[PDB]
């Protein structure tokens, strides 16, 4: 319950935050919604001597549209994602899936950026960001770079983010008219991390799948894109057999960890089931 | 008008709103952690990182030099006061602070005293302890093997404990009840027989408010005051006095507002002792408040029974005999809350709601490297296990005979005319009417229609879901009392009530119990309201302060209404008798010429001539009639003649997703009969809560240990606690079959929903797999475990 | 230590706090607003729920120092001149509390949830109250308490 | 002084401490558990010191 | 006067009077000591609280 | 305007800010909760407020807290050492030198200092040396016996 002692900093600009990260080094940690960082500190899992709070930086907030790209501030709180008229119209998947994340109180503090930066295989945004083909803008002492969601997750709690960088915003292309989507999440109770999860974004053309994106939650050390699974559908008629093939291809890449949520046997089978349910729910939403 | 006066009282039977709500809804409740005293320091505990091993060395210097830290105590500081070990309610001894070795992970090794909880936490991290890991004992069976490691090296050489002879060093005791010879004989000649093995998993009560206290020894006055999360402050005081040498009248224990107990706050935990010792040493207040992980990991757990049930019967379903053998895991030390003469509680109540002619049970207690406990979660002293067993067995017998589960129960029920009914185990059930209640439940849910929907669904091999119907008809046994057979550390299990009427008509009442949110301040007032014609609103009730309240045994096992409820009525009735005597003097008539009508004594015939309780109260203080002492008050200590036996009939319908193993409770119908009802609103709340605990235990709760003895899922991260979303809508019903021996015919009811719901959920889950031969599935019925069984019996997808 | 100014229950509070001090301890230990409770160390129970700058937040997972210039409301501040708030009245009337440990957090959540959704359905209530655990009520009466408060807020 | 002894047999006695414990442990038949009392005294006359 | 004997022999006593320095907490205890065979030191007397 | 001061009470530094008109007696009672010292009058006669300041007996109701910045103040709460009663406290207890106990804290602080000014006092000297303290309960007789007791204990 009791976190260790640390020095606090509250910069008002990304630049000041980046400077502090460079000045203080690895002993400093960016504090965002705090709903992953503080819990870890309260259990003495992580003991940073410096906390750089980034809640007072306005440039990390806001949801806007630049062409066909929806720009989401890293400090956008989960509930603002749900209530955002832009996200509801342009990226319905994120608005609905955010409802499956934690609970109301947590959603008032936890941000999309922190959910992604944490890099926990158990979190929902990593898979979601892959299904929607998002990109992340990172700012460091040298400037800004943009990396894809697909390739950002390296390992458990590890991402492309450098120790002197701050994720500024999440850029995701608006859904094209008629885009189908889904996020099936098998969980023990509301507000708990998924036992297995699957994010899907797809487009239809006649009786075939013209566009397909499949991602898996909590069935490997990182969220996973299932390209082989995608390949079982692209340009093919949407049939029961094709959906089953996609699940098998997704199942094949699972490397679940055994814990109280179940063994590898169960998690893998649930990943397949969530893939089957996700694809079907996505197809139903296509037009 | 007479009816209006009775309504104005807000007494027996009324669903009046609670008196205790005002403070709680405004954040003005007074819980242990809310307390702040002058010079109060904070204590924190250094806990064992391993499950079993010797203590090589404890380093206190780094913590002692830390600014803010006043003291770091170890078992060595406790030896002079002979407090490194403390007696338990089970007749065993538990370590206050590990001395030569640690017996379970998270065990208390040392304590720190600092200015606040923040510095205190830093001090625990600064205290380093070196250990020599020893082989761990997790499974009760491996514990009894000839080459099993010696856990209790302190008991070496002993051949007897506090509950009979000991056959192994890890063996705690063996207890039995019933007619073994007769039962063995019945089974040998029985035409139909069934035997099933079932594990009742170790779970934790996990009250929202954890355990804690603010101990305060005043060296100037020479006395101790401890504010504590205790379900039995009076016995705590007696024990604390004995172990401290401080005379009992100079020891004051006070249970303030407690955030739930559920049997978790009945015992004395090492944290309390250390706080007291620390307070006595430092000469100032010391506060100790455990965190959630400490609560789940070290306070009293529940269940953990490995049962082998057997049932003998005839082809038509009439039960001839019952045979049960059990292996009980009590952890490192036996601190299992229980009456001194019952190491397995009232497990011999497992005959259930059925007229079973012969039966025998045998419980074997075993030590393991785990935290102590066993009785602590609306269990009524092992009744939860007894009911689960009998109900599970009846289902097994029903399925073997291809007989409907309700029909086999109705056929075996103890009939209404058989009460008071003496069972094969020796219990005298006070009253009941199971048949009427069963038909009532079956009718309300259209049971036949349910079985048809189930039959229609099973017929289709493609049905995406499985339908399950669970039914439990149980009898509880609450009101732990008869001093001849029931006693806590030698104290008879009675209870008391002192009521004092003031000159102007209002009153103050104190009992030996202690509510933890069950509503005593409202309900107790309602009992007295009806007995004396004084509105419940001005009858102020208090409990928990050993320095003001009459001695009692506290509240757990739903004993309050049975025991204290009787003492309240009797103490009230002593006052009513004196009041009649006073009314006679005032009205210049004889007592026999008077009639009590709600709130006044009126002369038979002439209604205009009467004297209210207000009139009588005043007279008592003004000038007492010759022969009587001034005042109007009474005290009563009730030694109950028997327990109370409330019953219930619960039905649950579930739908299992064949593709994921997820179980959705489609419906749950609970009918409870606790005799005379004091407050229907309060009763409904207890049911809702208990059924919810039942759902949590059957569908999700568990406390798994890995091969090395580390407790897994000991925080809310994994330990299951349902939210408003997972909790189903409960349907409640009832009947009224009063306890003949009880002063107001009221029976306990708070623990019934817990005890009965657990086997109802398993009954529903097993019944969903029944058609493919499944007889039992161990809890918890999490989606992971149900899917595992789904794949095994080829029902997955 | 950082000097902050937090508006708690309508009153300014200029205090010197250690950065590691959790808002829940600041509220309970410094201001003695002991209504808010602690039921866990993992941020699940929500017995510490308070209203911060227009939102429901679990004060055990927020730092007091972060409330510099913030508007914080606790259960002690719900009643108006002694007259109970709709939610307080609802829990009382509908017997939505027993031990009363989770009550302050429930009330603070319901107080905000009802402004987020004035006419919620039962499903919406249960889901909207998911961050708060209760060990005594079984939630059923709490649902009725929220419904009761909602009816009076639109009265 | 502080015990009840059997007439003609000093070896057989019970102190108030023994009695008190007995009162809470196992009350004799026809007696409520515990050991306490209350008394409201309405004096018959005043006291006249000098 | 109300006297309650505890399980271990000590006792608590309360009366309807209220000392202002005349020594009731001592004298009252002495009266009870002689009547019950319990030392006056452990007979805790209290007054003044109407509850 | 409040003045910041640090008073040493019973060997402990007390850092406070009080208005200049704050009498020492209220500072001890209200700001420090050292409610042993009492108020029995408004004319400086009773002595129920007597505390030891910089080695002298002083009626705290007629002295300003603001005049004690850096002073050494001794109150009744500080006579005992490690729990062991000072000869003066033991004297009043053994000789029944108190009933209601309202003048006691003042009597003790005065006796404490008087016994240093005069180690072997005659009865007349005791009665005279204790003239600044009024008592409504004792009649003074047991008080002089108490001081004689404390006197003897200090010499052995
Ligand atoms: C009870 C509970 C249940 C939860 N359930 C779920 C769930 O079901 N699904 C789910 O997905 N999540 C869940 N969460 C987690 C919330 O979703 C995680 O709150 C949030 O993961 C970590 O985001 P944050 O905004 O709180 O940031 P923090 O806690 O501050 O953590 C941020 C982490 O990423 C870094 N970081 C943060 N922001 C940035 C930035 N802008 N640039 C660079 N680095 C940054 C930090 O240094 C740190 O390592 C739950 C949390 C709790 C307490
Ligand atoms: N017949 C009954 C039994 C209990 N109750 C009430 O329900 C609450 C729990 O009663 P209980 O005797 O079963 O349990 P504890 O209060 O011992 O936990 C107490 O307030 C009650 O008075 C009731 O109204 N009527
Ligand atoms: S104390 Fe449990 S969520 Fe805050
Ligand atoms: S009323 Fe006790 S936890 Fe909610
Ligand atoms: S109060 Fe009387 S002399 Fe000081
Ligand atoms: S004892 Fe009362 S004034 Fe001295």
User: Which H, E and C letters describe B699-743, residue by residue?
Assistant: HCCCCCECCCCCECCCCCCCCCCCCCCCCCCCEEEECCCCCCCCC
Pick from C19, C43, C128: CB nearest A104: C128
CA angle B624-B629-B635, nearest 5°?
125
Here the tokens at position B740 are 């003949």
**What separation in angstroms does the CA of B103 have from each of B110, B183, B369, C11?**
14, 39, 5, 51
DSSP per position, B436-462: HHHHHHHHHHTHHHHHHHHHHHHH-TT
Question: What is the pairing mode between strands A50-53 and A7-9?
Answer: parallel
Q: Report CA(B262)–ligand 4 centroid distance (Å).
A: 12
Which fold is adopted by the domain B478-643? Answer: Aldehyde Oxidoreductase; domain 4 (3.30.365)
Q: CA nearest B187: which of B70, B320, B292?
A: B320
Phi/psi of residue B243, nearest 5 degrees: -80, -20
**Which class does domain F2-75 fall in?**
alpha beta
The residue written with tokens 């305007």 in the block is: F1
* CB A116, CB A126: distance < 8 Å: yes
In total, chain D counts a number of residues equal to 50
Bond prior to C110 in cis (omega within 30° of 0): no
DSSP per position, B547-606: TTSPP---S-TT-IIIIIHHHHHHHHHHHHHHHHHHHHHHTTS-GGGEEE-SSEEEESS-
Helix (H) or strand (E) holding F84, with range, is none
Eight-state DSSP code of residue B21 = H
Q: Where in chain C is the domain with CATH 3.10.20.30?
A: 1-74
* CB B761, CB B391: distance < 8 Å: no
Residue F94 and residue F88: Cα distance in Å, rounded? 10
Residue B378 is among the residues annotated as catalytic for this protein: yes
Which spans in B335-433 are helix H?
A: 383-401, 407-412
Q: Is F100 close to E20, i.e. CB distance below 8 A?
A: yes
Split into its structural domains, chain A has a count of 3
Helix (H, G, I), strand (E, B) or coil at C20: coil
Q: CA nearest B170: which of B370, B334, B367, B364?
A: B367
Here the tokens at position A141 are 């002492």
As a CATH number, domain C1-74 is 3.10.20.30
* CB A216, CB A254: distance < 8 Å: yes
Q: F23: Cβ below 6 Å to ligand 5?
A: no
Cβ contacts of B43 within 8 Å, gap of 6 or more: B111, B112, B113, B114, B120, B271, B274, B275, B278, B286, B287, B288
Q: Report CA(B518)–ligand 2 centroid distance (Å).
A: 7
Residue E41 and residue B772: Cα distance in Å, rounded? 75
Q: Which residues line ligand 3 (CB under 6 A)?
A: C 38-40, 43-48, 58, 60
Residue B650 and residue B672: Cα distance in Å, rounded? 8
Q: CA nearest B11: which of B499, B523, B519?
A: B523
Q: Where in chain B is the domain with CATH 3.90.1170.50?
A: 1-135
Chains B and E, touching by 3 or more CB pairs within 8 angstroms: yes
Eight-state DSSP code of residue F145 = H
Residue A230 and residue A250: Cα distance in Å, rounded? 9
Q: Are residues A125 and A193 located together in one domain of the fold?
A: no
Residue A265 and residue B158: Cα distance in Å, rounded? 48
Q: Where in chain F is the domain with CATH 3.10.20.30?
A: 2-75
* CB B133, CB C35: distance < 8 Å: no
The residue written with tokens 């049932």 in the block is: B311
The residue written with tokens 């509250």 in the block is: A10
Which CATH code, of 1.10.150.120, 2.40.10.220, 3.40.190.10, 1.10.1740.10, is assigned to C79-154? 1.10.150.120
Q: Are residues A168 and A67 located together in one domain of the fold?
A: yes
Residue B747 and residue E45: Cα distance in Å, rounded? 38
Query: Active-site residue among B206, B336, B379, B497?
Result: B379
The residue written with tokens 């502080």 in the block is: D2
- Reading across the β-sheet that carries A208-217, which strands appear in turn? A180-186, A196-205, A208-217, A224-225
CA angle A263-B48-B303, nearest 5°?
55
The residue written with tokens 């390949």 in the block is: A231
The residue written with tokens 């103890």 in the block is: B414
Taking the Cβ of residue C38 and every Cβ of chain B, the question of whether any pair is shorter than 8 Å is answered with: yes
Cβ contacts of A276 within 8 Å, gap of 6 or more: A243, A244, A246, A247
Describe the crossing of helices B565-586 and B613-622 by its angle, rounded to 10 degrees: 70
Q: Is B660 close to A270, i.e. CB distance below 8 A?
A: yes
At the fourth CATH level, the homologous superfamily of domain B1-135 is: Aldehyde oxidase/xanthine dehydrogenase, a/b hammerhead (3.90.1170.50)
Q: Are residues A205 and A150 located together in one domain of the fold?
A: no
As a CATH number, domain F80-155 is 1.10.150.120
DSSP per position, chain A: --PPP-EEE--SSHHHHHHHHHHHGGGEEEESS-TTHHHHHHTTS---SEEEE-TT-GGG--EEEETTEEEEETT-BHHHHHH-HHHHHH-HHHHHHGGGSS-HHHHTT-BHHHHHHH--TT-SHHHHHHHTT-EEEEE-SS-EEEEESTTTEEETTEES--TT-EEEEEEEEPPPTT-EEEEEEE-SSTTS--SEEEEEEEEEETTEEEEEEEEEESSSSS-EE-HHHHHTTBTSB--HHHHHHHHHHHHHT--PPPBTTB-HHHHHHHHHHHHHHHHHHHHHH--
Q: Which of A33, A54, A75 is the last residue of a domain?
A: A54
Method: X-ray
Phi/psi of residue A84, nearest 5 degrees: -70, 120
What resolution in angstroms does the PDB record give? Answer: 2.3
Domain B434-477+644-797 is found in CATH 3.30.230.10: no
- The greatest distance separating any two alpha carbons of chain F, rounded to the nearest whole angstrom, comes to 51
Q: After which residues is chain A broken (C to N over 2.5 A)?
A: none
Phi/psi of residue F154, nearest 5 degrees: -70, -25
Report CA C155 to chain centroid distance, whole Å.
Answer: 23
- Reading across the β-sheet that carries B507-511, which strands appear in turn? B539-542, B507-511, B495-501, B633-638
Taking the Cβ of residue C28 and every Cβ of chain B, the question of whether any pair is shorter than 8 Å is answered with: yes
Q: CA nearest A231: which of A206, A205, A250?
A: A250
- Min Cα distance B339 → chain D (Å) is 13
Q: Where in chain F is the domain with CATH 1.10.150.120?
A: 80-155
Q: Where in chain C is the domain with CATH 1.10.150.120?
A: 79-154
* CB B713, CB A260: distance < 8 Å: yes
- Min Cα distance B209 → chain A (Å) is 15
Neighbors of chain C with 3 or more C-beta pairs under 8 Å: A, B
**What separation in angstroms does the CA of E18 have from each of B503, D50, E27, E50, F97?**
19, 24, 13, 11, 21
The residue written with tokens 């999700």 in the block is: B700
Phi/psi of residue B671, nearest 5 degrees: -115, 120
Question: What is the pairing mode between strands B301-302 and B373-374?
Answer: parallel
**What separation in angstroms does the CA of C121 have from each of A2, C144, C150?**
38, 11, 11
Here the tokens at position C13 are 């509070």
Q: Which of A173, A194, A223 is the last residue of a domain?
A: A173
Residue A130 and residue A128: Cα distance in Å, rounded? 5
Residue A123 and residue A218: Cα distance in Å, rounded? 7
* CB B784, CB B661: distance < 8 Å: yes
Q: Residue B419 CB: number of other CB atoms within 10 A?
A: 17
Which residues of chain B are within 8 Å of residue E10 when distances are taken between CB atoms?
241, 247-250
Residue B547 and residue B512: Cα distance in Å, rounded? 11
* CB B203, CB B299: distance < 8 Å: no
Domain with residue A45: its CATH number is 3.30.43.10
**Which class does domain B204-300 fall in?**
alpha beta
**What separation in angstroms does the CA of B418 have from each of B116, B183, B423, B430, B472?**
62, 22, 11, 10, 21
Which residue of chain C comes nearest to B29, CA vs CA? Answer: C35
The residue written with tokens 């400037």 in the block is: A143
Cβ contacts of A16 within 8 Å, gap of 6 or more: none
> What burial letters (b/e) apply to F63-86, b meaning 16+ CB within 10 Å?
bbbbebeebebbbbbbbeeeeeeb
Phi/psi of residue C14, nearest 5 degrees: -90, 115
* CB B253, CB B265: distance < 8 Å: no
Q: Where in chain B is the domain with CATH 3.30.365.10?
A: 136-203+301-377, 204-300, 434-477+644-797, 478-643
Residue B327 and residue B367: Cα distance in Å, rounded? 11
Bond prior to B517 in cis (omega within 30° of 0): no
Question: What is the pairing mode between strands B128-133 and B53-59?
Answer: antiparallel
Helix (H) or strand (E) holding B70, with range, is strand B69-74
**What separation in angstroms does the CA of B421 have from each of B203, B320, B356?**
33, 17, 11
Residue A153 and residue B385: Cα distance in Å, rounded? 49
Q: CA nearest A146: which of A129, A168, A117, A164?
A: A168
- The greatest distance separating any two alpha carbons of chain E, rounded to the nearest whole angstrom, comes to 31
The ligand with the least distance to the CA atom of C132 is: 3
Cβ contacts of B601 within 8 Å, gap of 6 or more: B579, B580, B583, B584, B587, B594, B595, B610, B611, B616
* CB B206, CB B291: distance < 8 Å: no
Eight-state DSSP code of residue F2 = -
How many CA atoms does the CB half-sphere of B379 hold within 13 Å?
A: 33
Cβ contacts of C46 within 8 Å, gap of 6 or more: A103, A105, C39, C58, C102, C105, C109, C131, C132, C133
* CB B494, CB D33: distance < 8 Å: yes
Q: After which residues is chain F broken (C to N over 2.5 A)?
A: none
- Min Cα distance A262 → chain B (Å) is 6
Helix (H) or strand (E) holding B192, with range, is strand B192-200
The ligand with the least distance to the CA atom of B515 is: 2
Which residues of chain A are within 8 Å of residue C57 when distances are taken between CB atoms?
105, 108-109
Describe the crossing of helices B752-769 and B383-401 by its angle, rounded to 10 degrees: 30
Eight-state DSSP code of residue B782 = -
Residue A14 and residue A22: Cα distance in Å, rounded? 12
Domain that holds residue A7: 1-54
The residue written with tokens 């209200």 in the block is: F30
Residue F131 and residue C113: Cα distance in Å, rounded? 71
Its sign, for the CA torsion F135, F137, F142, F146, is negative
Q: Which residues line ligand 2 (CB under 6 A)?
A: B 518-520, 523, 555, 558-561, 674-679, 682-683, 686, 746-750
Q: Which of A173, A189, A214 is the last residue of a domain?
A: A173
Residue A93 and residue A127: Cα distance in Å, rounded? 12
Q: Are residues A49 and A64 located together in one domain of the fold?
A: no
> What burial letters (b/e) apply to B91-110, b meaning 16+ CB within 10 Å?
bbbbbbbbbebbbbbbbbbb
Here the tokens at position B291 are 């965190």
Describe the crossing of helices C140-153 and C103-116 by its angle, rounded to 10 degrees: 50
Phi/psi of residue B367, nearest 5 degrees: -85, 140
Task: Mark residue B159 as left, alpha or beta (left: phi above 0; alpha: psi -120 to 50; beta: remaining).
Answer: alpha
Residue B717 and residue B733: Cα distance in Å, rounded? 35
Residue E38 and residue D3: Cα distance in Å, rounded? 10
Eight-state DSSP code of residue B203 = B
F103 is in an annotated binding site: yes
């Amino acid at each position: 319950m009791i976190p260790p002692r640390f020095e606090y900093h509250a910069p008002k600009s990304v630049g000041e935050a980046v400077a502090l990260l460079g000045q203080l080094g690895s002993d400093a940690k960016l504090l965002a919604g705090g709903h992953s960082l503080l819990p870890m500190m309260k259990l003495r899992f992580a003991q940073p001597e410096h906390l750089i709070d980034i809640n007072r930086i306005p440039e990390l907030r806001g949801i806007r549209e630049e062409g066909s790209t929806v720009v989401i501030g890293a400090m956008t709180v989960e509930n603002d994602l749900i209530s955002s008229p832009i996200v509801q119209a342009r990226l319905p998947l994120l608005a609905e899936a955010a409802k499956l994340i934690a609970d109301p109180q947590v959603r008032n503090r936890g941000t999309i950026g922190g959910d992604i930066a944490h890099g926990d295989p158990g979190n929902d945004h990593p898979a979601l960001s892959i299904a929607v083909e998002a990109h992340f803008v990172l700012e460091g002492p040298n400037g800004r770079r943009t990396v894809p969601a697909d390739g950002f997750f390296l390992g458990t709690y590890m991402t492309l983010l450098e120790e002197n960088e701050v994720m500024v915003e999440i850029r995701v292309p608006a859904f094209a008219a008629g885009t189908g989507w889904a996020y099936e999440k098998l969980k023990r109770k509301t507000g708990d991390w998924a036992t297995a999860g699957c994010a899907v974004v797809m487009r239809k053309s006649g009786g075939t799948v013209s566009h397909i994106r499949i991602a898996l939650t909590n069935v490997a050390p990182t969220a996973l894109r299932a390209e082989a699974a995608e390949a079982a559908l692209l340009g093919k008629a949407f049939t029961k057999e094709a959906v089953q093939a996609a699940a098998d291809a997704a199942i094949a890449i699972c490397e679940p960890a055994e814990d109280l949520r179940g063994d590898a046997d169960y998690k893998t089978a649930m990943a397949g089931q969530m893939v089957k349910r996700a694809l079907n729910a996505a197809w139903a939403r296509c037009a | 008008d007479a009816e209006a006066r009775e309504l104005a009282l807000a007494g027996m039977g009324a669903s009046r709103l609670r008196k205790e709500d005002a403070r709680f809804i405004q954040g003005k409740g007074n819980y242990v952690d809310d307390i702040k005293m002058p010079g109060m320091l904070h204590m924190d505990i250094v806990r064992a990182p391993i499950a079993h091993g010797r203590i090589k060395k404890i380093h206190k210097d780094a913590a002692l030099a830390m600014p803010g830290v006043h003291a770091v105590l170890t078992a060595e500081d406790l030896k002079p006061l002979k407090l490194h070990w403390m007696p338990t309610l089970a007749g065993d001894v538990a370590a206050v602070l590990a001395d030569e070795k640690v017996h379970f992970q998270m065990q208390e090794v040392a304590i720190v005293i600092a200015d606040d909880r923040y510095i205190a936490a830093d001090a625990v991290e600064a205290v380093k302890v070196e250990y020599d890991e020893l082989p761990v004992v997790i499974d009760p069976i491996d514990a009894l093997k000839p080459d099993a490691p010696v856990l209790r090296e302190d008991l070496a050489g002993k051949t007897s404990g506090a509950h009979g002879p000991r056959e192994h060093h890890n063996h705690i005791f063996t207890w039995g009840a019933g007619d073994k010879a007769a039962t063995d004989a019945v089974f040998a000649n029985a035409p139909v027989t069934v035997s099933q093995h079932m594990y009742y998993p170790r779970v934790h009560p996990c009250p929202l408010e954890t355990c804690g206290c603010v101990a305060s020894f005043d060296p100037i006055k020479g006395d101790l005051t401890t504010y504590i999360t205790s379900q039995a402050p009076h016995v705590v005081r007696t024990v604390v006095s004995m172990l401290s040498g401080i005379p009992e009248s100079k020891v004051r224990i006070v249970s303030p507002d407690i955030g739930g107990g559920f049997g978790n706050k009945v015992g004395i935990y090492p944290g309390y002792v250390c706080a007291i010792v620390a307070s006595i040493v430092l000469g100032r207040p010391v506060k100790w408040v455990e965190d959630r992980v400490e609560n789940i990991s070290t306070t009293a757990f529940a269940r953990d029974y490995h049962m082998d049930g057997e049932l003998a019967a005839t082809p038509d379903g009439k039960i001839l005999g019952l045979r049960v053998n059990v292996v009980a895991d009590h952890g490192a030390f036996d601190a299992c809350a229980d009456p001194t003469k019952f190491p397995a509680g009232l497990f011999h109540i497992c005959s259930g709601s059925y007229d079973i002619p012969r039966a025998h049970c045998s419980v074997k207690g075993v030590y393991t490297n785990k935290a102590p406990g066993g009785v602590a979660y609306r269990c009524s002293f092992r009744v939860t296990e007894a009911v689960y067993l009998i109900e599970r067995m009846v289902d097994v017998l029903a399925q073997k005979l291809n007989m409907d589960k309700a029909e086999i129960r109705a056929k075996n029920f103890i009939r209404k005319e058989q009460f008071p009914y003496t069972t094969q185990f020796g219990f005298e059930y006070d009253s009941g009417d199971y048949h009427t209640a069963l038909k009532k439940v079956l009718d309300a849910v259209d049971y036949p229609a349910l079985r048809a929907e189930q039959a229609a669904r099973r017929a289709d091999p493609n049905s995406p879901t499985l339908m399950g119907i669970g039914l439990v008809t149980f009898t509880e046994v609450v009101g732990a009392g008869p001093s001849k057979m029931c006693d806590i550390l030698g104290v008879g299990m009675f209870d008391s009530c002192e009521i004092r009427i003031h000159p102007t008509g209002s009153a103050i009442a104190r009992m030996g119990t202690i509510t933890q949110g069950q509503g005593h301040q409202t309900t107790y007032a309602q009992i007295i309201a009806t007995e004396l014609g004084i509105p419940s609103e001005v009858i102020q009730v208090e409990e928990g302060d050993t320095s003001t309240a009459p001695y009692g045994l506290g509240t757990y096992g739903s004993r309050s209404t049975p025991v204290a409820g009787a003492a309240i009525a009797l103490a009230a009735r002593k006052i009513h008798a004196k009041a009649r005597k006073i009314a006679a003097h005032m009205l210049e008539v004889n007592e026999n010429d008077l009639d009590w009508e709600v709130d006044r004594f009126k002369v038979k015939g002439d209604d205009s001539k009467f004297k209210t309780m207000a009139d009588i109260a005043w007279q008592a203080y003004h000038q007492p009639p010759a022969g009587l002492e001034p005042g109007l008050e009474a005290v009563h200590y009730y030694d109950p003649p028997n327990f109370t036996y409330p019953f219930g009939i619960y039905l649950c319908v579930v739908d299992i997703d064949r593709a994921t193993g997820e179980t959705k409770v489609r419906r749950f119908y609970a009918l409870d009969d606790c005799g005379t009802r004091i407050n229907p609103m309060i009763i409904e709340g207890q049911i809702h809560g208990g059924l919810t605990e039942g759902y949590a235990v059957a569908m999700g709760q568990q406390m798994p240990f890995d091969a090395q003895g580390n407790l897994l899922g000991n925080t809310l991260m994994d330990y299951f606690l349902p939210t408003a979303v997972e909790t189903p809508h409960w349907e409640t019903d009832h009947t009224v079959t009063p306890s003949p021996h009880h002063p107001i015919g009221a029976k306990g009811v708070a623990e019934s929903p817990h005890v009965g719901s657990i086997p109802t959920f398993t009954a529903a889950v097993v019944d969903a797999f029944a058609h493919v031969g499944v007889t039992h599935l161990d809890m918890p019925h999490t989606s992971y475990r149900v899917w595992k069984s789904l794949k095994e019996h080829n029902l997955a997808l | 230590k950082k000097i902050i100014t937090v508006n708690v229950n309508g009153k300014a509070q200029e205090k010197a706090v250690e950065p590691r001090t959790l808002l829940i301890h600041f509220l309970r230990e410094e201001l003695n607003l002991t209504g808010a409770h602690i039921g866990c160390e993992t941020s699940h129970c929500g017995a510490c729920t308070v209203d911060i700058d227009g939102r429901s937040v679990k004060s055990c997972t927020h730092l007091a120092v972060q409330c510099d210039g913030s508007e914080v409301l606790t259960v002690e501040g719900l009643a108006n001149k002694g007259v109970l708030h709709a939610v307080q009245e609802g829990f009382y009337k509908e017997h939505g509390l027993q031990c009363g440990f989770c009550t302050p957090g429930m009330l603070m959540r319901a107080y905000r949830f009802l402004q987020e959704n004035p006419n919620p359905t039962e499903a919406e209530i249960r889901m909207g109250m998911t961050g708060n655990l209760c060990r005594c009520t079984g939630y059923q009466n709490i649902v009725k308490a929220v419904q009761y408060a909602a009816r009076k807020l639109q009265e």
